[PDB]
Amino acid sequence: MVTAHFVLIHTICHGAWIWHKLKPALERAGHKVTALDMAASGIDPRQIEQINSFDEYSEPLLTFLEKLPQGEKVIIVGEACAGLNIAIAADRYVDKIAAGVFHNSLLPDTVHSPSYTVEKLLESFPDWRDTEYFTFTNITGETITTMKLGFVLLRENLFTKCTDGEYELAKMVMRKGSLFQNVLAQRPKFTEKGYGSIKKVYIWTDQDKIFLPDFQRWQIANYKPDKVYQVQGGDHKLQLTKTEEVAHILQEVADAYA
Amino acid sequence: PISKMVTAHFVLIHTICHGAWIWHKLKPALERAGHKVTALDMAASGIDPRQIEQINSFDEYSEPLLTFLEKLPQGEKVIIVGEACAGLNIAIAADRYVDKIAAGVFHNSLLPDTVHSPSYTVEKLLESFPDWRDTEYFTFTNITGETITTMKLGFVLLRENLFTKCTDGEYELAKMVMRKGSLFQNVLAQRPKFTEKGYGSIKKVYIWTDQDKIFLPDFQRWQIANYKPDKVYQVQGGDHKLQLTKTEEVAHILQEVADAYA
Amino acid sequence: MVTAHFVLIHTICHGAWIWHKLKPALERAGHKVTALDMAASGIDPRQIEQINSFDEYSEPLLTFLEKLPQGEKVIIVGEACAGLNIAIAADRYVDKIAAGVFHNSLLPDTVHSPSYTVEKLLESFPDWRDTEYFTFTNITGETITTMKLGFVLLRENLFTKCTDGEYELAKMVMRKGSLFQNVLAQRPKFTEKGYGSIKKVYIWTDQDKIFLPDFQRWQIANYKPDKVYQVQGGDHKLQLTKTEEVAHILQEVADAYA
Amino acid sequence: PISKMVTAHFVLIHTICHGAWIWHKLKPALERAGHKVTALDMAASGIDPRQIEQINSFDEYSEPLLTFLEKLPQGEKVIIVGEACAGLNIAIAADRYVDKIAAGVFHNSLLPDTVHSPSYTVEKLLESFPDWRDTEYFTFTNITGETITTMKLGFVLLRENLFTKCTDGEYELAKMVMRKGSLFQNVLAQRPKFTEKGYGSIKKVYIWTDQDKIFLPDFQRWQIANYKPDKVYQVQGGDHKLQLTKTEEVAHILQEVADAYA
């Protein structure tokens, strides 16, 4: 049983709180767990209008990795859009990373633009139902779109099978967020030597009602992970609906990549 | 003979450092019963964007509740449930909006009175529970030059004294969203006493457990004696966060409060 | 000759740079001088859209005073709108302040709202010529108006008699700024015990082409300073056009209030 | 026989840590002569809103110049005057917009060549002037994992080595608006050499003074020998900031550059 240090990264609009059931499950097995709020997410004091790119949004992860003591390596687990924070972080700190785990997540590649899987997601799931959109101009003049996720979308598409206490928690702490899609479209592609070299484990469920089966299967086909684990049932938030299954897969990842 | 069942609009108020999130289990339980439930973040709490150093008094901290009550429709009344330091939010709200309040429910909460300074039950709480263990304190200077003490609750105090019997997912949640907070105790000491007409007139239900490891039995009993509640409900077992360890029990007590007052 | 520690505070849109001629003149006389960039001003990295009130904008001054060693007192010199930063700071740190000096500045009082002298200024000088205006919503939902000062306004009204090198410097480092007028209108009035008790010296010139003679005379009449010094000629930026005169008056203030 | 006087469009480029502001005396002097003058802040310099830790190479740092040249009208050419490290901005710009550049003027500046790595004159500068006295250094990791060294220039180095003979108002100004900066030296070392067709083809005028106390006489003379300028103007006296201590003299030299090349 290898014991590992996992860094859990929530998706846009959410915060470290979505890992509140998975963090103690992992700790029951002796793992070290760090759950971070990205900029303007969870209780991070910055507002989304001051964040200018997805790399800036990743700052809490990059600062953490910047400070990781020499010779320590982590397994970064990212849910939904956090696959982009894993790719950004892996290009900067490749040697600090034992493996990246994508949990019903975007799986960026090295061959297309950084926005490519965001484009495919939006093609697959174009209607975000009652989500509201806003814009602001970032410091270099680009128009950034933010969203405030709609509660029907939260109930039916993200937290489909979650407990009412979990769905209510989500409405009480959800924040605005942004794909920074147009800034990712202008971003240099992820490198082979950094992100391209990381070990990559893809966890998913075909009962996900927002990262739909055909988009997740397109992703796997588009850039084959080292391992794909498919959990039966649950929903998009497997760290809430299938917490022990996810904890079990991550023990297999710690065993395989330490 | 005649029995009555009533649906009510509850407004749930967290204590300093916390947010609307500690009510995430009690809010669905009450809605199961058909009640309307509002859970508000007070200033600089939960995901409220303000920082505590921009807040200058416990009144200023109460703004989300006051705004909410200002907006209530003509003839709508609510029952305000406040946990721990939120009894001061109930007293501040009651002196501004007495006719919009059907009852105040104090849930392992400070029970201010009208006879003493607004800071009086805070002094007694601290005499009772002077050591906040690994809690860290800070200070800032407010808009009129008062030194305000803020605190970052320590994780052992969180585990052992506030969330004693809560599950690990609930304790882990608390650590992920807890904010700085302040008692504003010295500015409460300079504050006009709560009025009789406002706060003194409100119905007051006191819910508590003698297993609470931070608002301790001798303090809670002193408050009940100091300012007799219209009704007291002691819940056996649980811990300070009865809305997490005794959610159904608190929801059923709150149904009785609605039947009686709403 | 008393030697004093002066804290110089620029007006909105400007930064510590407007004191670049007055700071060495004061230092030639043995004074300690601190020139601060307020939030989102000079080279301060914050952008104006993240600042939510004039009290927040005053943070560099309040942090400085927060840290002033016990028993030290300063003379805060504020130009144009910086009279509001002196009043905000004096209510929080009255005992740290030997005197407030208003240099062609707003002179807030205790009897009216904090926005009252801003209203009178705008009544006196309603047209800011080629200045541009923008708005953003602050974190509590108020609409904040920002301005980017127009260069004709800069040349003719603010830097009227200044050297071309000084006017060119102003265009190279000017930033956006805000009066936060509507938040000042909702702000508790300045207190008697803090701001009301400070010694107050008013320096002005009747050749000021933006804080016009009748507004400055209305201010003096509205809340009589302990001392009024009137410099002949120059323009609105007396610390550039009459630097030695200003340095001389401030030596008299150090002598009188230490 | 026939004499020629020409008005030109000069684009003035500050060195790392500085901004458009060090040109505040030379810009009016040139406009006195009827020239059009643009002085740009490069990324994270002057009042540019970007922070240096978001910039990943000296090319990325040069974006304001590149954007400006992209926007120049068809047939407009400019003379780029760069001080100290800005000779690298001139070389980066010239390999993208050679036909918009009438001449590059290196003003107590790095004079990159096409034969060696882009980092070569930066290595020679540091061999020549290894001790930056009270300058503080920091590091951050860029977008592909390179460690970038940034510096906050020390005030004694500012006073004695960069602004030696400048007035106190100019030295005080520098302290009030100086930013962090970076040579990006290791990323320049990995960079493709400047091309012959672009940068190699540009006219190059080298202005310098042997009284410069940071770009020292032996370094400046080595650069002139290393990559012969089309014209050299040595200004007697002054200091590193000749656009402040010899503004009129630099403006008159720049009139000669316009007469010759614009």
Q: What is the DSSP secondary-structure string of C1-67?
A: ----EEEEEPPTT--GGGGTTHHHHHHHTT-EEEEE--TTSTT-S--GGG--SHHHHTHHHHHHHHH
∠ Cα C239 C242 C248 (to 5°) = 85
Q: Which letter does DSSP use for residue D144 in this model?
A: T
Contact B144 C91 (CB under 8 A): yes
- D230 Cβ contact list (under 8 Å, min separation 6): D103, D203, D204, D205
Secondary-structure percent of chain C, ordered helix, strand, coil, rounded to 5: 40, 15, 40
Secondary-structure percent of chain D, ordered helix, strand, coil, rounded to 5: 40, 20, 40
Please state whether beta strands C200-204 and C97-103 pair in parallel, antiparallel, or not at all (unpaired): parallel
- With beta carbons less than 8 A apart as the criterion, state whether B249 and B221 touch: no
- Measured CA to CA, the distance from residue D154 to residue D151 in angstroms comes to 9
- Measured CA to CA, the distance from residue C148 to residue C133 in angstroms comes to 7
- With beta carbons less than 8 A apart as the criterion, state whether A10 and A19 touch: yes
Chains interfacing with A (3 or more CB pairs < 8 Å): B, C, D
Distance separating the N- and C-terminal Cα atoms of chain A:
10
Phi and psi at A34, nearest 5°, equal -120, 120
DSSP secondary structure, A154-219, as one string: IIIIISTT--HHHHHHHHHH---B---HHHHHTSPPPPTTTGGGS-EEEEE-TT-SSS-HHHHHHH
Contact C169 D169 (CB under 8 A): no
List b or e across C214-236, with b for residues whose CB sees 16 or more CB atoms inside 10 angstroms. ebbebbbeebebebbbebeebbb
- Measured CA to CA, the distance from residue C244 to residue B96 in angstroms comes to 56
| Interfacial residues of D (vs A; Cβ cutoff 8 Å) | 49-50, 54, 140-145
- Measured CA to CA, the distance from residue B240 to residue B214 in angstroms comes to 7
- Measured CA to CA, the distance from residue B189 to residue B119 in angstroms comes to 5
- C248 Cβ contact list (under 8 Å, min separation 6): none
Q: Which letter does DSSP use for residue C229 in this model?
A: E
Element (H, E) at A229: strand A227-230
- Measured CA to CA, the distance from residue B169 to residue B164 in angstroms comes to 13
Which domains, from first to last, does chain B contain? 1-262 (3.40.50.1820)
Q: Which letter does DSSP use for residue D224 in this model?
A: H
DSSP-H helix ranges across C68-148:
83-93, 116-124
Phi and psi at A15, nearest 5°, equal -160, -170
Phi-psi region of C162 (alpha: psi -120 to 50; beta: other; left: phi over 0): beta
- Measured CA to CA, the distance from residue B29 to residue B246 in angstroms comes to 11
- Measured CA to CA, the distance from residue B153 to residue A17 in angstroms comes to 17
- With beta carbons less than 8 A apart as the criterion, state whether A210 and A158 touch: yes
Which residues on adjacent β-strands are paired with residue C5?
C32
Q: What CA–CA distances, in Å, run from D256 to B170, D107, D262?
A: 76, 14, 10
**Residue D145: its chain A contacts at CB < 8 A?**
91-94, 194
∠ Cα C184 C185 C190 (to 5°) = 65
Element (H, E) at C143: strand C143-148
Which residues on adjacent β-strands are paired with residue C145?
C135
Please state whether beta strands B231-234 and B204-208 pair in parallel, antiparallel, or not at all (unpaired): parallel
CA atoms within 13 A on the CB side of C245: 17
- Measured CA to CA, the distance from residue C128 to residue A223 in angstroms comes to 58
Going along chain D, which residue ranges are E strands? Answer: 9-13, 36-40, 78-84, 101-109, 136-141, 147-152, 204-208, 231-234
| Structure-token match 């920002």, residue found | C146
Residue type, position D138, single letter: F
Phi and psi at B83, nearest 5°, equal -100, 150
- Measured CA to CA, the distance from residue B180 to residue B18 in angstroms comes to 8
Task: Report how far Cα D105 is from the mean position of its chain's Cα atoms.
Answer: 9
Residue type, position C232, single letter: Q
Chains interfacing with C (3 or more CB pairs < 8 Å): A, B, D
> 3-class DSSP state for residue C115?
coil
CA atoms within 13 A on the CB side of B170: 23
- With beta carbons less than 8 A apart as the criterion, state whether A226 and A126 touch: no
- Measured CA to CA, the distance from residue B160 to residue B162 in angstroms comes to 6
Rounded-to-10 torsion of CA B73, B76, B82, B86:
40
DSSP secondary structure, A58-95, as one string: THHHHHHHHHS-TT--EEEEEEGGGHHHHHHHHHHHGG
For B231, the token pair is: 């009704």
CA atoms within 13 A on the CB side of A204: 26
Which residue in B111, B95, B117 sits closest to B187, CA to CA? B117
- Measured CA to CA, the distance from residue C88 to residue C91 in angstroms comes to 6
- Measured CA to CA, the distance from residue B93 to residue A215 in angstroms comes to 51
- With beta carbons less than 8 A apart as the criterion, state whether B77 and B100 touch: yes
Q: Which letter does DSSP use for residue D160 in this model?
A: I
Q: Which letter does DSSP use for residue C132 in this model?
A: E
What is the widest separation between alpha-carbon atoms in chain D?
61
**Residue A47: its chain C contacts at CB < 8 A?**
50, 139
Please state whether beta strands A74-79 and A97-103 pair in parallel, antiparallel, or not at all (unpaired): parallel
Please state whether beta strands D78-84 and D36-40 pair in parallel, antiparallel, or not at all (unpaired): unpaired
Chains B and D: 3 or more CB pairs within 8 Å of each other: no
Give the Cβ contact number of residue D97 at 10 Å: 19
DSSP-H helix ranges across C100-202:
116-124, 151-153, 164-173, 181-185
∠ Cα B174 B175 B181 (to 5°) = 80
Which residue in D78, D135, D74, D123 sits closest to D104, CA to CA? D78
**Residue A20: its chain B contacts at CB < 8 A?**
169-170, 172-173, 176
**Residue C47: its chain A contacts at CB < 8 A?**
50, 139
List b or e across D121-156, with b for residues whose CB sees 16 or more CB atoms inside 10 angstroms. bbebbeebbeeeeebeeeebbbbbbeebebbebebe
Q: At what angle do helices C83-93 and C59-67 cross, to 10 degrees?
A: 40
- Measured CA to CA, the distance from residue A35 to residue A37 in angstroms comes to 7
| Interfacial residues of B (vs A; Cβ cutoff 8 Å) | 19-21, 23-25, 27-28, 39, 41, 46-47, 49, 51, 168-173, 176-179
Distance separating the N- and C-terminal Cα atoms of chain D:
20
**Residue C66: its chain B contacts at CB < 8 A?**
140-141
- With beta carbons less than 8 A apart as the criterion, state whether A91 and A191 touch: yes
Strand order across the beta sheet in which D101-109 lies: D36-40, D9-13, D78-84, D101-109, D204-208, D231-234
**Cross-chain CB nearest to B24 (options A24, A43, A165):** A165
Best interface-test mutation with C: which of A49, A51, A136 has the largest number of C CBs within 10 A? A49
Resolution in A: 2.1
Contact A91 D145 (CB under 8 A): yes
- Measured CA to CA, the distance from residue B84 to residue B162 in angstroms comes to 10
Phi and psi at C45, nearest 5°, equal -75, -10
- Measured CA to CA, the distance from residue D151 to residue D139 in angstroms comes to 9
Q: Burial, B127: exposed, middle or buried (Cβ in 10 Å; 0-12, 13-18, 19+)?
A: exposed
> 3-class DSSP state for residue C212?
coil
Give the Cβ contact number of residue B131 at 10 Å: 9
For C188, the token pair is: 């508790």
> 3-class DSSP state for residue A16?
helix
| Interfacial residues of A (vs B; Cβ cutoff 8 Å) | 15-17, 19-21, 23-24, 35, 42-43, 45, 47, 164-166, 168-169, 172-175
Which residue in B188, B183, B187, B179 sits closest to B142, CA to CA? B187
> 3-class DSSP state for residue D220?
helix
Q: At what angle do helices D63-71 and D87-97 cross, to 10 degrees?
A: 40
- Measured CA to CA, the distance from residue B44 to residue B22 in angstroms comes to 15
- With beta carbons less than 8 A apart as the criterion, state whether B55 and B41 touch: no
Which residues on adjacent β-strands are paired with residue C193?
none
Q: Which letter does DSSP use for residue D164 in this model?
A: T
- Measured CA to CA, the distance from residue D223 to residue D219 in angstroms comes to 6
- Measured CA to CA, the distance from residue D68 to residue D100 in angstroms comes to 11
Q: What CA–CA distances, in Å, run from A97 to A100, A199, D152?
A: 7, 9, 32
List b or e across D198-232, with b for residues whose CB sees 16 or more CB atoms inside 10 angstroms. bbbebbbbbbbbebbbbbbeebbebbbeebebebe
- Measured CA to CA, the distance from residue C128 to residue C150 in angstroms comes to 8
- With beta carbons less than 8 A apart as the criterion, state whether B176 and A17 touch: yes
Please state whether beta strands C32-36 and C5-9 pair in parallel, antiparallel, or not at all (unpaired): parallel
> 3-class DSSP state for residue D261?
helix
> 3-class DSSP state for residue D127?
helix
Q: At what angle do helices C116-124 and C213-222 cross, to 10 degrees?
A: 150
Give the Cβ contact number of residue C127 at 10 Å: 8
List b or e across D26-59, with b for residues whose CB sees 16 or more CB atoms inside 10 angstroms. bbbbbeeeebebbbbbbbbbbbbbbbbbbbbbbb
- With beta carbons less than 8 A apart as the criterion, state whether C201 and C229 touch: yes
**Residue B44: its chain C contacts at CB < 8 A?**
none
Secondary-structure percent of chain A, ordered helix, strand, coil, rounded to 5: 40, 15, 40
For C67, the token pair is: 């840290």
Task: Report how far Cα A166 is from the mean position of its chain's Cα atoms.
Answer: 19
Distance from CA of A147 to the nearest CA of C (A): 16
The alpha carbon dihedral of A88, A89, A93, A95 has a sign of negative
Three-class SS string for chain B? CCCCCCCCEEEEECCCCCCHHHHCCHHHHHHHCCCEEEEECCCCCCCCCCCHHHCCCHHHHCHHHHHHHHHCCCCCCEEEEEEECCHHHHHHHHHHHHHHEEEEEEEEECCCCCCCCCCHHHHHHHHHCCCCCCCEEEEEECCCCCEEEEEECCHHHHHHHHCCCCCHHHHHHHHHHCCCECCCHHHHHCCCCCCCCCHHHCCEEEEECCCCCCCCHHHHHHHHHHCCCCEEEECCCCCCCHHHHCHHHHHHHHHHHHHHHC
- B229 Cβ contact list (under 8 Å, min separation 6): B106, B111, B204, B205, B206
Which residue in B10, B12, B18 sits closest to B34, CA to CA? B10
- With beta carbons less than 8 A apart as the criterion, state whether A62 and A81 touch: no
> 3-class DSSP state for residue D139?
strand
- D3 Cβ contact list (under 8 Å, min separation 6): none
| Structure-token match 């999130």, residue found | B21
Q: Which letter does DSSP use for residue C251 in this model?
A: H
| Structure-token match 């894993």, residue found | A86
Which residue in B107, B39, B111 sits closest to B68, CA to CA? B39
- Measured CA to CA, the distance from residue B163 to residue B240 in angstroms comes to 7
Task: Report how far Cα B212 is from the mean position of its chain's Cα atoms.
Answer: 15
Which residue in C67, B200, B24, D135 sits closest to A165, CA to CA? B24
> 3-class DSSP state for residue A238?
helix
Q: Which letter does DSSP use for residue C198 in this model?
A: S
- With beta carbons less than 8 A apart as the criterion, state whether C94 and C77 touch: no
List b or e across A16-41, with b for residues whose CB sees 16 or more CB atoms inside 10 angstroms. bbbbbbbbbbbeeeebebbbbbbbbb
